[PDB]
Design an enzyme around this catalytic site. Structure first.
Site, PDB file in Angstrom:
ATOM      1  CE1 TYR A   1     -14.193 -20.341  -3.956  1.00 45.58           C
ATOM      2  CE2 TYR A   1     -12.308 -21.565  -3.105  1.00 45.58           C
ATOM      3  CZ  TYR A   1     -13.037 -20.383  -3.185  1.00 45.58           C
ATOM      4  OH  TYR A   1     -12.574 -19.279  -2.505  1.00 45.58           O
TER       5      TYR A   1
ATOM      6  N   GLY B   1      -3.133 -14.574  -5.572  1.00 42.73           N
ATOM      7  CA  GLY B   1      -4.317 -15.321  -5.192  1.00 42.73           C
ATOM      8  C   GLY B   1      -5.320 -14.507  -4.375  1.00 42.73           C
TER       9      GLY B   1
ATOM     10  CG  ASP C   1      -7.406 -25.216  -1.316  1.00 41.63           C
ATOM     11  OD1 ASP C   1      -8.550 -24.868  -1.692  1.00 41.63           O
ATOM     12  OD2 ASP C   1      -6.869 -24.943  -0.175  1.00 41.63           O
TER      13      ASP C   1
ATOM     14  CG  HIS D   1     -11.995 -21.476   2.903  1.00 44.60           C
ATOM     15  ND1 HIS D   1     -10.634 -21.298   2.894  1.00 44.60           N
ATOM     16  CD2 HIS D   1     -12.485 -20.507   3.684  1.00 44.60           C
ATOM     17  CE1 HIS D   1     -10.332 -20.237   3.640  1.00 44.60           C
ATOM     18  NE2 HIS D   1     -11.434 -19.763   4.143  1.00 44.60           N
TER      19      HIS D   1
ATOM     20  CE  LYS E   1      -4.170  -2.053   2.169  1.00 42.50           C
ATOM     21  NZ  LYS E   1      -4.750  -2.156   0.810  1.00 42.50           N
TER      22      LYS E   1
HETATM   23  C1  LIG Z   1      -7.124 -22.446   4.666  1.00 45.30           C
HETATM   24  C2  LIG Z   1      -7.353 -23.298   3.415  1.00 45.30           C
HETATM   25  C3  LIG Z   1      -7.585 -22.506   2.098  1.00 45.30           C
HETATM   26  C4  LIG Z   1      -8.587 -23.155   1.137  1.00 45.30           C
HETATM   27  O1  LIG Z   1      -9.228 -24.207   1.504  1.00 45.30           O
HETATM   28  S1  LIG Z   1      -8.651 -22.149  -0.517  1.00 45.30           S
HETATM   29  C5  LIG Z   1      -9.676 -20.706  -0.127  1.00 45.30           C
HETATM   30  C6  LIG Z   1      -9.036 -19.410  -0.318  1.00 45.30           C
HETATM   31  N1  LIG Z   1      -9.659 -18.814  -1.438  1.00 45.30           N
HETATM   32  C7  LIG Z   1      -8.910 -18.168  -2.311  1.00 45.30           C
HETATM   33  O2  LIG Z   1      -7.709 -18.068  -2.126  1.00 45.30           O
HETATM   34  C8  LIG Z   1      -9.624 -17.585  -3.512  1.00 45.30           C
HETATM   35  C9  LIG Z   1      -9.241 -16.157  -3.794  1.00 45.30           C
HETATM   36  N2  LIG Z   1      -9.013 -15.405  -2.568  1.00 45.30           N
HETATM   37  C10 LIG Z   1     -10.028 -14.959  -1.842  1.00 45.30           C
HETATM   38  O3  LIG Z   1     -11.207 -15.193  -2.133  1.00 45.30           O
HETATM   39  C11 LIG Z   1      -9.638 -14.051  -0.692  1.00 45.30           C
HETATM   40  O4  LIG Z   1      -8.247 -13.712  -0.772  1.00 45.30           O
HETATM   41  C12 LIG Z   1      -9.994 -14.719   0.669  1.00 45.30           C
HETATM   42  C13 LIG Z   1      -9.240 -16.045   0.836  1.00 45.30           C
HETATM   43  C14 LIG Z   1     -11.503 -14.950   0.787  1.00 45.30           C
HETATM   44  C15 LIG Z   1      -9.613 -13.753   1.807  1.00 45.30           C
HETATM   45  O5  LIG Z   1     -10.267 -12.451   1.600  1.00 45.30           O
HETATM   46  P1  LIG Z   1      -9.624 -11.126   2.271  1.00 45.30           P
HETATM   47  O6  LIG Z   1      -8.801 -11.394   3.463  1.00 45.30           O
HETATM   48  O7  LIG Z   1     -10.775 -10.219   2.163  1.00 45.30           O
HETATM   49  O8  LIG Z   1      -8.429 -10.747   1.287  1.00 45.30           O
HETATM   50  P2  LIG Z   1      -8.534 -10.196  -0.189  1.00 45.30           P
HETATM   51  O9  LIG Z   1      -7.989 -11.138  -1.186  1.00 45.30           O
HETATM   52  O10 LIG Z   1      -9.891  -9.740  -0.535  1.00 45.30           O
HETATM   53  O11 LIG Z   1      -7.585  -8.891  -0.106  1.00 45.30           O
HETATM   54  C16 LIG Z   1      -6.654  -8.796   1.009  1.00 45.30           C
HETATM   55  C17 LIG Z   1      -6.044  -7.416   1.088  1.00 45.30           C
HETATM   56  O12 LIG Z   1      -4.674  -7.584   1.487  1.00 45.30           O
HETATM   57  C18 LIG Z   1      -3.965  -6.467   0.973  1.00 45.30           C
HETATM   58  N3  LIG Z   1      -2.552  -6.813   0.878  1.00 45.30           N
HETATM   59  C19 LIG Z   1      -2.026  -7.965   0.347  1.00 45.30           C
HETATM   60  N4  LIG Z   1      -0.723  -8.032   0.429  1.00 45.30           N
HETATM   61  C20 LIG Z   1      -0.362  -6.842   1.039  1.00 45.30           C
HETATM   62  C21 LIG Z   1       0.888  -6.309   1.397  1.00 45.30           C
HETATM   63  N5  LIG Z   1       2.042  -6.934   1.199  1.00 45.30           N
HETATM   64  N6  LIG Z   1       0.903  -5.094   2.003  1.00 45.30           N
HETATM   65  C22 LIG Z   1      -0.264  -4.471   2.215  1.00 45.30           C
HETATM   66  N7  LIG Z   1      -1.497  -4.871   1.917  1.00 45.30           N
HETATM   67  C23 LIG Z   1      -1.481  -6.080   1.325  1.00 45.30           C
HETATM   68  C24 LIG Z   1      -4.556  -6.191  -0.394  1.00 45.30           C
HETATM   69  O13 LIG Z   1      -4.288  -4.839  -0.680  1.00 45.30           O
HETATM   70  C25 LIG Z   1      -6.021  -6.618  -0.222  1.00 45.30           C
HETATM   71  O14 LIG Z   1      -7.013  -5.576  -0.356  1.00 45.30           O
HETATM   72  P3  LIG Z   1      -7.970  -4.628   0.547  1.00 45.30           P
HETATM   73  O15 LIG Z   1      -7.290  -4.441   1.904  1.00 45.30           O
HETATM   74  O16 LIG Z   1      -9.434  -4.952   0.672  1.00 45.30           O
HETATM   75  O17 LIG Z   1      -7.965  -3.488  -0.446  1.00 45.30           O
END
Ligand SMILES: CCCC(=O)SCCNC(=O)CCNC(=O)[C@H](O)C(C)(C)COP(=O)(O)OP(=O)(O)OC[C@H]1O[C@@H](n2cnc3c(N)ncnc32)[C@H](O)[C@@H]1OP(=O)(O)O
Ligand SMILES: CCCC(=O)SCCNC(=O)CCNC(=O)[C@H](O)C(C)(C)COP(=O)(O)OP(=O)(O)OC[C@H]1O[C@@H](n2cnc3c(N)ncnc32)[C@H](O)[C@@H]1OP(=O)(O)O
EC number: 5.1.99.4
Lengths: 360, 360
Positions: free
Chosen positions: B130, B83, B156, B126, B62
């Protein structure tokens, strides 16, 4: 031919399970895939949609003519896929050493369950056998029952074909430097072990036990499991993160103050009882509407037959229609060199016709 | 760095589940993998062994500086993995177009569950979610019970990370011909559908039903299931082919003429009861010995903690000791450019160090 693997030439020695699934995907992504089956086989056009994006030819590899025609194809191709027991291709005269002599650029891809050596290397097996030995099968299913196979998804495909593909494609990247092919040795017992590397990691840090049905991701956690609804159908809950879990509770009508803590595992029986009663009070389609557009991680558990009516599936064209049946479109997707719809299984082709087409 | 992917450069924006798994496999096979995490989450040396074969750098993306430093990495790299939900990298100014301005060769790899667009594209989720939408979860488990999640192996990893990898490596191949990178959109809902294409094919040919627990490969078939033994441990039986099935019956001490036909499904409950009694009369280790070197497709179902004592596992070095315990060695295996044993998760390094290492 559409897709990122346009130009790639592949010879597949016909088998079952992972080898055809890998070959299908290379075809799916634009590779030119030629499948050699035995003639005691192919009674016209295949009904097996896993044999899409293929040219089929027949050839007795036991004969001299068969062998020679096979070796001419391999000579003009980028990849060979075989999935017979170790030693079969050697004895047929199509082993890695013999192929190396007619084409040292060849990626020689060997798809087995147990691998090329070791005490089980000659035993027959299927998916369920390969995942039984590396700890995976034991971890799948409810605690009060015997293990249940996760179809053939984890050994054949996820831990088999997909590692075959990564090997083929990694080897093709390497060949860009060296000008040289090599042997890819993909065993389902190894691939599937890497597929479950997470559990081996968590096991090392005390965050995973060997007790079936008593971990966070195996159905032991009340917030990562399926629930039966009023109509006898099911939803899935995957609300691991506390903010998603809170959203699910609010949607269910339960006050956090009345429930045990989300991760107090000693009170998981109570928590499960509470969630069970709440999900059972309305039908699946109710919960689907309530939770659409939410971060509650609650989704309906659709049967294959219902998938074609789900808006998100329809809109992204995850499926295409073919022979009274939907089939999955290629994955993954590419911005510039997109895959096209798969071509159905075609009638057999003559093997000289291929050699001629490949420029011969 | 040993392995076929020596000299491939990969920047990983830290996330959970599939992206890290893909990054790991790239590392495993000798890619140069740099993982950007946020400073707030990094403590000591990381104890998640899924973070092996990486360099870790922290950077507030950021901040103006964090962003600049990251675009300098991406400039010097072949592949970027992210991701996050769709839109997230764009708003950081790390979207596919910002990246194409500093490096039109980059493979831009986007790992999501639901895809880049469509009605569910901003929904948290998670693995279990899916696979609930595309028919897979409904098909797993016993018929008289609610579906059981096959850990997180199918969404995953199998249908997730593995398709991201096939996409990254297929795009590197396309690139050698075109000079140009592109965007890979790997959706778990898509990948996992391709992973289960065999069932879609089988449904079209009337060879698979939507009824749970009533199919050849879901646990319904008495010859493709687990059985409890006299000691309460389990064997797996995978004797689909009739010759293997016959060999299994003889070793159980069962006269094939006393039994219903292998594939008379109306009599499967009866067949199962006969096989259940047979397997129950001796312990697991007895059956493992009895069927060693056999094609009967009967294997002991080992728990994670027993896998280190299995000869076939020991002798192929499927695992190496680390840290707390055993971890899977890289897969698949390569004859010429062989992978080496994984480097543990090292301490955080500064992002300038890395840029020195990579040149500009
Ligand atoms: C534990 C087992 C995992 C499973 O079974 S797979 C399920 C995980 N699903 C996925 O990965 C599919 C795609 N991802 C997602 O849907 C989401 O990332 C998930 C897992 C729901 C989590 O949602 P959130 O925590 O809301 O995260 P997000 O992806 O929407 O965005 C996260 C925010 O982090 C911020 N960020 C990332 N790296 C950063 C860095 N180095 N410095 C500063 N800020 C950073 C990034 O800017 C983002 O946006 P914001 O804060 O809303 O604008
Ligand atoms: C149905 C779902 C599949 C799953 O869940 S994965 C399970 C399958 N496992 C694997 O694929 C791993 C490696 N493969 C194997 O273990 C074996 O192929 C498998 C599946 C047990 C079948 O065993 P077998 O039928 O004994 O086959 P094998 O590998 O020992 O040898 C194959 C025989 O076919 C012959 N062959 C192949 N293509 C030919 C051609 N075009 N013309 C003439 N002969 C041909 C080859 O000569 C050999 O026969 P023979 O031993 O020489 O009599």
């Amino acid at each position: 031919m559409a897709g990122p693997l346009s130009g790639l030439r592949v010879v597949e020695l016909a088998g079952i399970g992972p080898g055809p699934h890998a070959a299908m995907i290379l075809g799916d992504l634009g590779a030119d895939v030629v499948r050699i089956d035995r003639p005691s086989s192919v009674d016209g056009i295949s009904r097996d949609a896993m044999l899409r994006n293929r040219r089929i030819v027949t050839a007795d590899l036991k004969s001299d003519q068969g062998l020679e025609l096979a070796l001419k194809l391999i000579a003009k191709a980028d990849v060979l896929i075989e999935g017979y027991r170790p030693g079969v291709t050697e004895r047929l005269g199509l082993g890695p050493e013999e192929c190396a002599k007619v084409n040292d650029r060849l990626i020689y891809a060997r798809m087995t369950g147990w691998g090329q050596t070791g005490p089980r290397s000659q035993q027959a097996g299927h998916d369920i056998n390969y995942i039984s030995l590396n700890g995976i099968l034991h971890a799948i299913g409810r605690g009060d029952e015997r293990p249940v196979p996760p179809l053939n998804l984890v050994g054949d495909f996820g831990g088999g074909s997909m590692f075959l593909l990564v090997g083929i494609l990694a080897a093709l990247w390497e060949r860009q430097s060296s000008g040289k092919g090599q042997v890819v040795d993909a065993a389902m017992v190894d691939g599937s072990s890497v597929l479950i590397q997470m559990m081996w990691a968590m096991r090392a840090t005390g965050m995973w036990t060997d007790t079936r049905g008593a971990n966070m991701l195996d159905g032991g956690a009340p917030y990562y499991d399926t629930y039966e609804c009023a109509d006898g159908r099911y939803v899935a809950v995957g609300a691991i993160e506390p903010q998603f879990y809170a959203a699910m509770l609010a949607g269910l009508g339960l006050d956090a103050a009345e429930l045990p803590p989300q991760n107090d595992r000693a009170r998981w029986p109570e928590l499960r009882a509470l969630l069970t009663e709440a999900f059972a009070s309305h039908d699946r389609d109710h919960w689907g509407a309530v939770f659409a557009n939410s971060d509650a991680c609650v989704t309906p558990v659709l049967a294959f037959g219902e998938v074609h009516n789900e808006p998100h599936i329809i809109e992204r064209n995850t499926f295409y229609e073919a022979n009274g049946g939907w089939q999955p479109m290629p994955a993954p997707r590419f911005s510039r060199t997109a895959s096209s719809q798969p071509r159905p299984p075609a009638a057999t082709i003559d093997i000289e016709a291929v050699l001629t087409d490949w420029d011969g």
